Amino acid sequence: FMPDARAYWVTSDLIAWNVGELEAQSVCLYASRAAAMSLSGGIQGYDSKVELQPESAGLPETVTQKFPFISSYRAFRVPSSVDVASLVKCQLVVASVDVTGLQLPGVLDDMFAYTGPLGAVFSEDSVSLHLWAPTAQGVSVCFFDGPAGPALETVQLKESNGVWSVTGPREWENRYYLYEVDVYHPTKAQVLKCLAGDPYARSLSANGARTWLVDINNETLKPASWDELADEKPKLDSFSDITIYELHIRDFSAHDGTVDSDSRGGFRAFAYQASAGMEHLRKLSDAGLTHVHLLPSFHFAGVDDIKSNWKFVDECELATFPPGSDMQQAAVVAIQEEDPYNWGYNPVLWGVPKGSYASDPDGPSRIIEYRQMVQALNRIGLRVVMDVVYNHLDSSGPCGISSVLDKIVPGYYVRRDTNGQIENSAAMNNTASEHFMVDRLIVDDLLNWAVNYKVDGFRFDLMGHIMKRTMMRAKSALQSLTTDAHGVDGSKIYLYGEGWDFAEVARNQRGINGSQLNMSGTGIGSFNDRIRDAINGGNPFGNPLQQGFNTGLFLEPNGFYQGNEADTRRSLATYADQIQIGLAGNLRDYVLISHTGEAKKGSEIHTFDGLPVGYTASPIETINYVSAHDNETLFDVISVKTPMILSVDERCRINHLASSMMALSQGIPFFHAGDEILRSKSIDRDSYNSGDWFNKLDFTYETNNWGVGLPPSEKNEDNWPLMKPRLENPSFKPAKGHILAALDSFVDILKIRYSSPLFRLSTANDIKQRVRFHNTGPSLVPGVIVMGIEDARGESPEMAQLDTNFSYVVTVFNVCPHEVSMDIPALASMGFELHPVQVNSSDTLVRKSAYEAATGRFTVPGRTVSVFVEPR
Ligand SMILES: OC[C@H]1O[C@H](O[C@H]2[C@H](O)[C@@H](O)[C@@H](SC[C@H]3O[C@H](O[C@H]4[C@H](O)[C@@H](O)[C@@H](O[C@H]5[C@H](O)[C@@H](O)[C@@H](O)O[C@@H]5CO)O[C@@H]4CO)[C@H](O)[C@@H](O)[C@@H]3O[C@H]3O[C@H](CO)[C@@H](O)[C@H](O)[C@H]3O)O[C@@H]2CO)[C@H](O)[C@@H](O)[C@@H]1O
Ligand SMILES: OC[C@H]1O[C@H](O[C@H]2[C@H](O)[C@@H](O)[C@@H](O[C@H]3[C@H](O)[C@@H](O)[C@@H](O[C@H]4[C@H](O)[C@@H](O)[C@@H](O)O[C@@H]4CO)O[C@@H]3CO)O[C@@H]2CO)[C@H](O)[C@@H](O)[C@@H]1O
Ligand SMILES: [Ca+2]
Ligand SMILES: [Cl-]
C-alpha cells in the first residue's frame, strides 16, 4: 500500500480534493496509527473512519490566497468529532474506487504554527531542547560524550502544541546529540524511527553526524575584540555606495603559497593579513570596493569534512598535458566526488559554518574561525555578504546523514506537486517558504548569521523560489537590529538575490514569489540579466557564438551567421538601448530615446521574450553584472565570442570595457572574483564540481588558468569543438604583464566611481533628472555609448549640489576598434577635462582622450572608456 497524495488537509476543519460532484457524495477519511491500511470495495485495516460532508461553499479566501494552485478544488468538512492532533500523526487516506493520501502543511500551520523557543536554550542552571514535530508519534534525545563515542543516555521529550521539549542540567552543555523521531514517512508508507540533527543547530561534528550542544554566546567562542566589531566596521552611508566582489572561500587560498599549507582553503586563510590574497583584497578595498560576497559557507553536502578522505589530482602530471586535451578533465572528474571542492549549493543545515572550511570539524573551531574571517575582512575595509540557499535541500526522506528537515516533519519543509511528489526545479527538494515554520526557520537563520556572526548582507540564491512575504519579513527583522540591543547595526544590512521566475512558482502559482518583477519597489536587489546579455551577447543557454555590444556584433563579425548587415546593426543598437536602461539603474520609468528614435520608458523596452527590460523602482534594486560564478568567466566569454584573430591585448581592453560599464553604472555593481585579473576556467560553463584545477585563482598573477585542458564533459562536451582551437592557440593566453595591467585598470575604474557621488545617485528621481544619453536614435554612431551626469551649476540651480569637485561628468564607452569623435553640441563651451585618474593612467591609450570646447567634441580611442569631468 503506497498511495499518492492528491488531497490536502488545509485547515483543522477542511480537506480539499479535486473530485467531481457525484464522487464528492461518498468521501471518507481513514486513519491508522500503525500505518496498517490496505485495499480490500473499500479501505481496510483502519483504526477509524469518518464521513466528510461536502462543503458546498468551497475553499475560503485564506486558503485560496495561501494555496492558489488548488483554489478550484472541492472542499470537504471534517466533523468536530475528529481529534485532529491525533490523526495527523497517523497514516491517512481519503477515499470515495479512488484512494489518496493527504498533504498536511495547511492544517499543520493552522493548528501548530509556533513562535516560542526552538533549538537549545541555555540558562544558568539548565539546558532545554525544543523541536517542532507535530506529526511525530515520539521524540527522544540521544546524548553522546564526544563526536565519536557511544550513546551515553537517551531522554524522552514531551509534546505540547506540536513542540517536543525537555529540560536538563547545565552539564548537558557541550554534549553531542541526535533526536530519535518516530514519524510517518509517506515515501515509505511506514512509521520510521529517524535519527536526526537539530534544524536549529549552531554547531555540528564532522559532516553533521551529531549536533554539538554549544552555547553560541560562550566567551571562548569570541575572537579578541569581537564585541567591539560594530565600531570597527567599515562605514556605509548608503546602499548606493555598494560594490560587490563574489568569491569562493576555497578558490581564495587553495593555490596561495603565501598561506601556510595546513591553512589553505578555508576560513583561517583570511586571518593572514600579509598573504597575497589578503593584499589583493586590500588593494581592491582601498580603491573603493565595499563588499565581498562569499559562496555558500553553511553546512552543505558534497564535500567531506574529514580531510583525511580528500583526494587530489597530480598537478605536475596534468600540467604536462596539451592545453586542448580532454585528459585533465578526465582526471579531475575521476575524483570530483571525493575532492575538497564544491560551490556548496547543497543545503543540509543553514545555521552552522561548513566544517570542511574549519581547521577541525569537531568542537569550536568552525565558529571562532568564521568570526575571525568576518573580523579580518572588516578590518581591511570590506563588509561580508553570505550566499544563502533557502530554496532547496540537498536531500529528503527518512534516511541518511544529509537529510535533516524532511526526516523530522516529512512532506512539510519541501514543496510538493499536486500528486504529492517533491518538486525539484531548484536542483532537488525545493523548499516551501510559503509554509509558516519554513518562513520562520529562514528568518531565524538570517538573524543568527547577522547577530552571532555579524554578517553584513545576504545574496539569496533562487529568490524567485522564496515567497515575497518571507523576503519582506526577513528584511524588516534584519534592518531593525541595533548595536545597543544586538551588537550590529541592522540598518546597514543589504539584501539582494536571483529573481528568476520559472517552473512551479511562475505566474504566482504558489503565492507572490521573489521574482524580478515582484521585488520591484521592495528595496531588495536583483541580478540584471538584461545588461549582462546585452553586453556579452546571446544568453548562457543559447548559441555560444552569438555576439553582443561588447563582443563584436556588427562591428567585428566573428563568422557565425547572425543575419544581414542591417539586421546586425539594428540588433547592436537594440542591445545598446538595453545597456543604457541598465546604466541608468534599470528603472521602469526612466525615459530613453530608443534606437528607432521613439522615446520609451525602461519598462517599454522589452526582452526578446516580452517582459520589461527596466523593472525596478530604485537603483538599489539593481545588481548590474556581466559575470558571476555561474556560466563563463568574463575573460572566457570574450574569448569565445570575439573574432578569433583579435590579439589578447585587444581582448584585455574588451574585458576592461565590460567591468567599466559595471563600475560606472547607476545601481550596484557586481564583479566576479577574477574579473580584475583576466580569470579563466578554460571555458568551463559550470565549474561547481570542477575542482581546484579549473577554478584556480592565482594571486601570483603568473597565470590566468586559460589553456589547462578542455573543461569537464558533463556540462561542456557539446561545445568542445569551439573550445579546443581557442585553448590550443598560444595567442589567446595572457601573460603576467596583461594580468597586472588588467588589475591596474580595474583599480582605476573603481577609483573613478568613488571620485564622484554622481555615479551613485540614490533615487530614481535623481537619475531621471541628471542622467542623459547622447548617442541615440536611428542614426546613432554604432559601438558608442555617451552618458552624461549633471550636477548643480550656475547661480540658482534647480537641483542639489552633490559633488564639491565636479559640476558634470561625461563617460564615453567606445567598443569600436578605432578612434571616434562624438560631437555633443549640448556640451559645447564647457570646462571638460579628462578625469585626473585617466590623465595619470598606466594605460597610454586612454591618455589621448580629448575634449574640444567649440564643438563639444569628445575624441576617444578604440576599445576605451574615457571619463571627462567639469571642474568646479
Ligand atoms: O546520493 C545521491 C547523490 O547525492 C549527491 O548529488 C545529488 C544531490 O545530493 C542532490 O541535491 C541533487 S543536486 C542536482 C543538480 O546538481 C547539479 O546542480 C548544481 C549546478 O550545476 C551548479 O551550477 C549550482 O547551481 C546553482 C547556481 O550556482 C546558483 O547561483 C543558482 O543559480 O542555483 C543553482 C542551485 O542552487 O549548484 C547546483 C547544485 O549543486 C547539476 O549540475 C544539476 O544538473 C542537477 O539538477 C538537475 O538534475 C536533477 C536530477 O538529479 C533535477 O532534480 C534538477 O531539476 C535538474 O536541474 O542531485 C545530485 C545527483 O543525484 C552526490 O553528489 C552524488 O555523488 C550522489 O550519487
Ligand atoms: O539548477 C541547475 C542549473 O544551475 C545553474 O544554472 C543557473 C544559471 O547558470 C544562471 O545563469 C541562472 O539562469 C537564469 C538566467 O541567468 C536568466 O537570464 C534566465 O534565462 C532565461 C532567459 O531570461 C529567457 O529569455 C530564455 O532565454 O531562456 C533563459 C533560460 O531559461 O533565467 C535563468 C533561470 O531559469 O540560474 C540558473 C539556475 O536556475 C547551472 O549553470 C546549470 O548548469 C544547472 O543545470
Ligand atoms: Ca567535488
Ligand atoms: Cl590534444
Automatic annotation (TrEMBL):
<keyword id="KW-0479">Metal-binding</keyword>
<comment type="similarity">
    <text>Belongs to the glycosyl hydrolase 13 family.</text>
</comment>
<dbReference type="InterPro" id="IPR013783">
    <property type="entry name" value="Ig-like_fold"/>
</dbReference>
<feature type="domain" description="Pullulanase N2">
    <location>
        <begin position="5"/>
        <end position="110"/>
    </location>
</feature>
<feature type="domain" description="Glycoside hydrolase family 13 N-terminal">
    <location>
        <begin position="117"/>
        <end position="185"/>
    </location>
</feature>
<dbReference type="Pfam" id="PF17967">
    <property type="entry name" value="Pullulanase_N2"/>
</dbReference>
<dbReference type="InterPro" id="IPR013780">
    <property type="entry name" value="Glyco_hydro_b"/>
</dbReference>
<dbReference type="GO" id="GO:0051060">
    <property type="term" value="F:pullulanase activity"/>
</dbReference>
<dbReference type="InterPro" id="IPR024561">
    <property type="entry name" value="Pullul_strch_C"/>
</dbReference>
<feature type="domain" description="Alpha-1,6-glucosidases pullulanase-type C-terminal">
    <location>
        <begin position="701"/>
        <end position="870"/>
    </location>
</feature>
<dbReference type="Pfam" id="PF11852">
    <property type="entry name" value="Pullul_strch_C"/>
</dbReference>
<feature type="binding site">
    <location>
        <position position="289"/>
    </location>
    <ligand>
        <name>Ca(2+) 1</name>
    </ligand>
</feature>
<feature type="binding site">
    <location>
        <position position="285"/>
    </location>
    <ligand>
        <name>Ca(2+) 1</name>
    </ligand>
</feature>
<dbReference type="InterPro" id="IPR017853">
    <property type="entry name" value="GH"/>
</dbReference>
<keyword id="KW-0106">Calcium</keyword>
<dbReference type="GO" id="GO:0046872">
    <property type="term" value="F:metal ion binding"/>
</dbReference>
<dbReference type="GO" id="GO:0000272">
    <property type="term" value="P:polysaccharide catabolic process"/>
</dbReference>
<protein>
    <submittedName>
        <fullName>Limit dextrinase</fullName>
    </submittedName>
</protein>
<feature type="binding site">
    <location>
        <position position="381"/>
    </location>
    <ligand>
        <name>Ca(2+) 1</name>
    </ligand>
</feature>
<feature type="binding site">
    <location>
        <position position="341"/>
    </location>
    <ligand>
        <name>Ca(2+) 2</name>
    </ligand>
</feature>
<dbReference type="InterPro" id="IPR040671">
    <property type="entry name" value="Pullulanase_N2"/>
</dbReference>
<dbReference type="InterPro" id="IPR014756">
    <property type="entry name" value="Ig_E-set"/>
</dbReference>
<feature type="binding site">
    <location>
        <position position="336"/>
    </location>
    <ligand>
        <name>Ca(2+) 2</name>
    </ligand>
</feature>
<dbReference type="Pfam" id="PF02922">
    <property type="entry name" value="CBM_48"/>
</dbReference>
<dbReference type="InterPro" id="IPR004193">
    <property type="entry name" value="Glyco_hydro_13_N"/>
</dbReference>
<feature type="binding site">
    <location>
        <position position="339"/>
    </location>
    <ligand>
        <name>Ca(2+) 2</name>
    </ligand>
</feature>
<feature type="binding site">
    <location>
        <position position="689"/>
    </location>
    <ligand>
        <name>Ca(2+) 2</name>
    </ligand>
</feature>
<dbReference type="InterPro" id="IPR011839">
    <property type="entry name" value="Pullul_strch"/>
</dbReference>
